[PDB]
Each structure stands twice: as C-alpha cells, then as structure tokens.
Design an enzyme around this catalytic site. Sequence first.
Site, PDB file in Angstrom:
ATOM      1  CB  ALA A  10     -18.158 -84.237   6.991  1.00 15.25           C
ATOM      2  CE  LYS A  11     -18.251 -86.495  -0.641  1.00 14.10           C
ATOM      3  NZ  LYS A  11     -18.996 -87.108  -1.772  1.00 14.10           N
ATOM      4  CG  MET A  12     -17.546 -76.913   4.255  1.00 11.93           C
ATOM      5  SD  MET A  12     -16.204 -76.372   5.330  1.00 11.93           S
ATOM      6  CE  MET A  12     -16.809 -74.765   5.850  1.00 11.93           C
ATOM      7  N   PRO A  13     -19.959 -77.624   1.733  1.00 14.37           N
ATOM      8  CG  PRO A  13     -22.249 -77.302   1.778  1.00 14.37           C
ATOM      9  CD  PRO A  13     -21.097 -77.670   2.659  1.00 14.37           C
ATOM     10  CB  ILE A  14     -16.858 -74.753  -2.290  1.00 20.62           C
ATOM     11  CG1 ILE A  14     -17.643 -74.620  -3.592  1.00 20.62           C
ATOM     12  CG2 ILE A  14     -16.199 -76.114  -2.163  1.00 20.62           C
ATOM     13  CD1 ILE A  14     -16.773 -74.808  -4.807  1.00 20.62           C
ATOM     14  CG  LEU A  15     -21.612 -69.925  -2.544  1.00 17.57           C
ATOM     15  CD1 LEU A  15     -20.602 -68.836  -2.268  1.00 17.57           C
ATOM     16  CD2 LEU A  15     -22.119 -69.784  -3.958  1.00 17.57           C
ATOM     17  N   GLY A  16     -21.028 -70.611   0.968  1.00 14.92           N
ATOM     18  CA  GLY A  16     -21.928 -70.424   2.089  1.00 14.92           C
ATOM     19  C   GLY A  16     -22.367 -68.980   2.212  1.00 14.92           C
ATOM     20  N   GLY A  18     -22.655 -65.716   4.527  1.00 13.64           N
ATOM     21  CA  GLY A  18     -22.176 -65.016   5.708  1.00 13.64           C
ATOM     22  C   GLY A  18     -23.290 -64.263   6.413  1.00 13.64           C
ATOM     23  CG  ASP A  43     -19.333 -68.180   8.750  1.00  8.55           C
ATOM     24  OD1 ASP A  43     -18.611 -69.132   9.114  1.00  8.55           O
ATOM     25  OD2 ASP A  43     -19.192 -67.005   9.183  1.00  8.55           O
ATOM     26  CE1 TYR A  48     -19.323 -62.550  13.308  1.00 10.98           C
ATOM     27  CE2 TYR A  48     -20.557 -64.111  11.964  1.00 10.98           C
ATOM     28  CZ  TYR A  48     -19.352 -63.521  12.322  1.00 10.98           C
ATOM     29  OH  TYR A  48     -18.181 -63.924  11.703  1.00 10.98           O
ATOM     30  CE  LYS A  77     -16.921 -67.721  11.854  1.00 10.15           C
ATOM     31  NZ  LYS A  77     -18.233 -67.009  11.685  1.00 10.15           N
ATOM     32  CG  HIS A 110     -14.994 -65.799  16.023  1.00 13.48           C
ATOM     33  ND1 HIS A 110     -16.300 -65.406  16.208  1.00 13.48           N
ATOM     34  CD2 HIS A 110     -14.561 -65.191  14.893  1.00 13.48           C
ATOM     35  CE1 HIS A 110     -16.646 -64.608  15.212  1.00 13.48           C
ATOM     36  NE2 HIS A 110     -15.613 -64.464  14.402  1.00 13.48           N
TER      37      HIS A 110
HETATM   38  N1  LIG Z   1     -13.968 -65.510  11.154  1.00 11.78           N
HETATM   39  C1  LIG Z   1     -13.958 -64.167  11.212  1.00 11.78           C
HETATM   40  O1  LIG Z   1     -13.271 -63.538  12.007  1.00 11.78           O
HETATM   41  C2  LIG Z   1     -14.788 -63.423  10.211  1.00 11.78           C
HETATM   42  C3  LIG Z   1     -14.518 -62.081   9.964  1.00 11.78           C
HETATM   43  C4  LIG Z   1     -15.251 -61.409   8.993  1.00 11.78           C
HETATM   44  C5  LIG Z   1     -16.234 -62.095   8.291  1.00 11.78           C
HETATM   45  N2  LIG Z   1     -16.490 -63.393   8.563  1.00 11.78           N
HETATM   46  C6  LIG Z   1     -17.598 -64.139   7.841  1.00 11.78           C
HETATM   47  O2  LIG Z   1     -17.489 -63.872   6.447  1.00 11.78           O
HETATM   48  C7  LIG Z   1     -18.715 -63.315   5.971  1.00 11.78           C
HETATM   49  C8  LIG Z   1     -18.446 -62.415   4.758  1.00 11.78           C
HETATM   50  O3  LIG Z   1     -17.609 -61.301   5.099  1.00 11.78           O
HETATM   51  P1  LIG Z   1     -18.166 -59.830   5.351  1.00 11.78           P
HETATM   52  O4  LIG Z   1     -19.531 -59.856   5.929  1.00 11.78           O
HETATM   53  O5  LIG Z   1     -17.114 -59.115   6.132  1.00 11.78           O
HETATM   54  O6  LIG Z   1     -18.180 -59.077   3.926  1.00 11.78           O
HETATM   55  P2  LIG Z   1     -18.395 -59.486   2.377  1.00 11.78           P
HETATM   56  O7  LIG Z   1     -19.169 -60.828   2.229  1.00 11.78           O
HETATM   57  O8  LIG Z   1     -17.075 -59.363   1.720  1.00 11.78           O
HETATM   58  O9  LIG Z   1     -19.275 -58.262   1.898  1.00 11.78           O
HETATM   59  C9  LIG Z   1     -20.596 -58.066   2.416  1.00 11.78           C
HETATM   60  C10 LIG Z   1     -21.077 -56.740   1.825  1.00 11.78           C
HETATM   61  O10 LIG Z   1     -21.175 -56.859   0.399  1.00 11.78           O
HETATM   62  C11 LIG Z   1     -22.494 -56.535  -0.046  1.00 11.78           C
HETATM   63  N3  LIG Z   1     -22.813 -57.419  -1.154  1.00 11.78           N
HETATM   64  C12 LIG Z   1     -23.056 -58.718  -1.109  1.00 11.78           C
HETATM   65  N4  LIG Z   1     -23.270 -59.220  -2.261  1.00 11.78           N
HETATM   66  C13 LIG Z   1     -23.169 -58.219  -3.162  1.00 11.78           C
HETATM   67  C14 LIG Z   1     -23.309 -58.170  -4.548  1.00 11.78           C
HETATM   68  N5  LIG Z   1     -23.610 -59.257  -5.289  1.00 11.78           N
HETATM   69  N6  LIG Z   1     -23.132 -56.960  -5.117  1.00 11.78           N
HETATM   70  C15 LIG Z   1     -22.831 -55.859  -4.390  1.00 11.78           C
HETATM   71  N7  LIG Z   1     -22.693 -55.875  -3.052  1.00 11.78           N
HETATM   72  C16 LIG Z   1     -22.857 -57.062  -2.450  1.00 11.78           C
HETATM   73  C17 LIG Z   1     -23.395 -56.751   1.181  1.00 11.78           C
HETATM   74  O11 LIG Z   1     -24.544 -55.898   1.116  1.00 11.78           O
HETATM   75  P3  LIG Z   1     -26.024 -56.346   1.516  1.00 11.78           P
HETATM   76  O12 LIG Z   1     -25.921 -57.386   2.687  1.00 11.78           O
HETATM   77  O13 LIG Z   1     -26.707 -55.081   1.916  1.00 11.78           O
HETATM   78  O14 LIG Z   1     -26.702 -56.998   0.250  1.00 11.78           O
HETATM   79  C18 LIG Z   1     -22.456 -56.274   2.298  1.00 11.78           C
HETATM   80  O15 LIG Z   1     -22.441 -54.855   2.423  1.00 11.78           O
HETATM   81  C19 LIG Z   1     -19.246 -62.580   7.216  1.00 11.78           C
HETATM   82  O16 LIG Z   1     -20.617 -62.191   7.100  1.00 11.78           O
HETATM   83  C20 LIG Z   1     -19.012 -63.671   8.260  1.00 11.78           C
HETATM   84  O17 LIG Z   1     -19.990 -64.699   8.112  1.00 11.78           O
HETATM   85  C21 LIG Z   1     -15.795 -64.064   9.497  1.00 11.78           C
HETATM   86  O1  LIG Z   2     -15.012 -61.620  14.424  1.00 10.93           O
HETATM   87  C1  LIG Z   2     -15.772 -61.499  13.331  1.00 10.93           C
HETATM   88  O2  LIG Z   2     -16.149 -62.465  12.682  1.00 10.93           O
HETATM   89  C2  LIG Z   2     -16.164 -60.107  12.902  1.00 10.93           C
HETATM   90  C3  LIG Z   2     -15.987 -59.079  14.045  1.00 10.93           C
HETATM   91  C4  LIG Z   2     -14.538 -58.573  14.062  1.00 10.93           C
HETATM   92  C5  LIG Z   2     -14.101 -57.636  13.118  1.00 10.93           C
HETATM   93  C6  LIG Z   2     -12.782 -57.179  13.135  1.00 10.93           C
HETATM   94  C7  LIG Z   2     -11.891 -57.661  14.098  1.00 10.93           C
HETATM   95  C8  LIG Z   2     -12.319 -58.591  15.051  1.00 10.93           C
HETATM   96  C9  LIG Z   2     -11.372 -59.115  16.068  1.00 10.93           C
HETATM   97  C10 LIG Z   2     -11.838 -59.841  17.171  1.00 10.93           C
HETATM   98  C11 LIG Z   2     -10.935 -60.345  18.107  1.00 10.93           C
HETATM   99  C12 LIG Z   2      -9.565 -60.122  17.951  1.00 10.93           C
HETATM  100  C13 LIG Z   2      -9.085 -59.392  16.853  1.00 10.93           C
HETATM  101  N1  LIG Z   2      -7.751 -59.174  16.677  1.00 10.93           N
HETATM  102  O3  LIG Z   2      -6.961 -59.818  17.339  1.00 10.93           O
HETATM  103  O4  LIG Z   2      -7.422 -58.342  15.849  1.00 10.93           O
HETATM  104  C14 LIG Z   2     -10.002 -58.900  15.916  1.00 10.93           C
HETATM  105  C15 LIG Z   2     -13.638 -59.053  15.021  1.00 10.93           C
END
Ligand SMILES: NC(=O)c1ccc[n+]([C@@H]2O[C@H](COP(=O)([O-])OP(=O)(O)OC[C@H]3O[C@@H](n4cnc5c(N)ncnc54)[C@H](OP(=O)(O)O)[C@@H]3O)[C@@H](O)[C@H]2O)c1
Ligand SMILES: O=C(O)CCc1cccc(-c2cccc([N+](=O)[O-])c2)c1
Length: 315
Positions: A10-16, A18, A43, A48, A77, A110
């Site tokens: 499958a193909k995944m969009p490179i921009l999503g 959050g 995402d 969340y 996740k 996750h």
């Molecule tokens: N798998 C994981 O454990 C994990 C962990 C962290 C994050 N994620 C995923 O990654 C996504 C992105 O990471 P993140 O939410 O930590 O932070 P981020 O995308 O690096 O930054 C989000 C912040 O930047 C601001 N922002 C967005 N666009 C902007 C722009 N063009 N100019 C200035 N400020 C801007 C947003 O403000 P506003 O919303 O107020 O506009 C918000 O405060 C998450 O939402 C989540 O879906 C996954």
């Molecule tokens: O999970 C997200 O996508 C954002 C919420 C979040 C933020 C920072 C750390 C952890 C987290 C959760 C479980 C375990 C650990 N860890 O082992 O450090 C961090 C979770």
Amino acid sequence: ASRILLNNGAKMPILGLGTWKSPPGQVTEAVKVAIDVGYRHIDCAHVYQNENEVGVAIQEKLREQVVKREELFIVSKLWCTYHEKGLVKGACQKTLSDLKLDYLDLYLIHWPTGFKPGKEFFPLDESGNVVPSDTNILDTWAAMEELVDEGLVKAIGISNFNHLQVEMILNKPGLKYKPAVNQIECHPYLTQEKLIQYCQSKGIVVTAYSPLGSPDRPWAKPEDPSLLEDPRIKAIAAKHNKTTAQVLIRFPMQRNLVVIPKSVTPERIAENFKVFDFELSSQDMTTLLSYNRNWRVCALLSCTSHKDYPFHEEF
Ligand SMILES: NC(=O)c1ccc[n+]([C@@H]2O[C@H](COP(=O)([O-])OP(=O)(O)OC[C@H]3O[C@@H](n4cnc5c(N)ncnc54)[C@H](OP(=O)(O)O)[C@@H]3O)[C@@H](O)[C@H]2O)c1
Ligand SMILES: O=C(O)CCc1cccc(-c2cccc([N+](=O)[O-])c2)c1
C-alpha cells in the site's frame, strides 16, 4: 511523489495531520479543514482521547464525498495497557468504532512498554513507578498480525522502538508480517541517523513525530531549545521564502520519511501542507542535520525502569 510504498504493497501519504493535544472541541474542524486543503493521512491514538471527534470529521467528509475512503490513510495506535494478547482486538475495535471506520490503514504498537491493564492509562504503584505487564512484545506482535488476518487493519507497525527492539520483532520466531512503519520522534535536534538507516535498510518506513519540536508539550520549559525560534533555521526558511515550520516539515520529507505535524489552527494546517513546491539543498539538509543534540520531547521518568524502556540504548 506524495506517497511512499509500504512493505504491505500500500501507499502512505508522506504528509499527515497529527492529533495529540488537539482539543476535542477543535479537532473536528481541524480534520475537516485538513481534508479540504489536501491532507489524506491523519495520525490518531486512543490515548489522545479525541478519536470520536476525529471520526466525526472523517465521516462528514466521506458523507459529503469530499474524499473516498480508499484515498484516506488513517493511522491509530494500541495503548500500553492493551498489550495482553486477549485485549488487542477489543482495543482496535474501540478505535474503529470511535473513528467510525471499518478498517485502519495502519495500526501501531504505541510504545514497546506494556502496562498493567485497567482503566488508568498509566497505572502506578504507591511510589509512582508505572506497573508493567508481563506480556512479551513478541506476543503482542502476534496479536497485531491477527488483526491483519481479520481485516481490521491493512498494515501493522511499531512506534518508539529502538534498534534492538526492531531487531527483536524482525527476528521473531514464525514472524508473519514485518512492521510496515516505525514512528519515532525526529527533528533537527534529534536527527536519529542510526535508527533511521537501520529501519530503512530493512524496508521499514519511518514516520517522524514532533517535527516542530512540540511547542505545546505540557512539560515545556522556557529555557528549552526551540526549533521554530532557532535563527539558523529561520535563515534557511528566509532563503527559500518559506516559513520555519515549512522547512521543518520539508526536512524529514527529503530523508524519505513520513511526517505528521499537528495543528488545530486553520491557517497553519494549510501552511503546513504547502511543502511540495520547494527543495532544500543537500547543503541545507546537512546543515539541519548538524543541529542534532539528542534532545527529546517524548520520554517519561515514570517508565525509565520498565524493562522495555526504549531510550537507554544509544539508538
Ligand atoms: N507515537 C508517539 O509516541 C507520538 C509522540 C508524539 C507525537 N506523535 C504524533 O505526532 C504529531 C506531531 O507531534 P506533536 O503534536 O508533538 O508536535 P508538533 O507537530 O511538532 O508541534 C505541534 C505544535 O506546533 C504548533 N504549530 C503547528 N504548525 C505551526 C506552524 N505552521 N507555525 C507555528 N506553530 C505551528 C501547533 O500549534 P496549534 O495546534 O495551536 O496551531 C502545536 O503547538 C502528534 O500530534 C501525534 O499525532 C506521536
Ligand atoms: O504517546 C504519545 O503519542 C504522546 C503521549 C506521550 C508523551 C511523552 C511520553 C509518552 C510515553 C508513553 C509511554 C512510555 C514512555 N516511555 O517509555 O518513555 C513514554 C507518551
């Protein structure tokens, strides 16, 4: 190219888009706007606490025929308290119900750390340590594979797995499906060269999270480094007549990564998508890489003694 080919075909969009920290009263409009301005990848995660509201937006745009389901790439996740094999399907089904979908394009473990099941997302002992699960992550992986075979998800992957943990999955006895994706924190202050090359060499696509440095993270300190305010990055942006955020989004794209900036601000949602009409030079890319300082947005003290805590290792 706007999409990257996964190892499931499958193909995944490179921009999503959050959705972590996107308030439930704002995220429906955020996702509607995102789809209207071209986003096709969202995402999500159960932890969340806003999947229902994300789902309302997706469903409206499907109903409005703004987009077809096959054109969307929806990611969620499996939270840490659902690593037990017997809980995985129900967790996936709850996410599907909230998102109002009959399948996910991608479902990720996750974090590699399993926690005791229960109502609390972070079950604690009386001293504040997270209470682990004894379920082996390989067993959780087998449960994820079953979701593919039941038609609930098109692809499975991992998130916040270090290279040894990725290797463990790849070396699982009787492995049926390789992880399609490892979603990890990645930006100019945490460039992740070692882990990225390892994953890519194994055909695992990497998604970069917190690409803007998560300025809305709850534990931000006034003196922390700030990507959006780094004059060096601002200078690269100015040279290209783009915003600093646009440079920060384009950067991982040119490393063959998927990137998922979060916003609930309509103007920024649109701004963040306007990143397909310029190119950073190799010199720009190497310069941005040089800003690495191994600085993380996402790592919790409560989990640092968990046997599967991912960030003790170099990578
Ligand atoms: N798998 C994981 O454990 C994990 C962990 C962290 C994050 N994620 C995923 O990654 C996504 C992105 O990471 P993140 O939410 O930590 O932070 P981020 O995308 O690096 O930054 C989000 C912040 O930047 C601001 N922002 C967005 N666009 C902007 C722009 N063009 N100019 C200035 N400020 C801007 C947003 O403000 P506003 O919303 O107020 O506009 C918000 O405060 C998450 O939402 C989540 O879906 C996954
Ligand atoms: O999970 C997200 O996508 C954002 C919420 C979040 C933020 C920072 C750390 C952890 C987290 C959760 C479980 C375990 C650990 N860890 O082992 O450090 C961090 C979770």
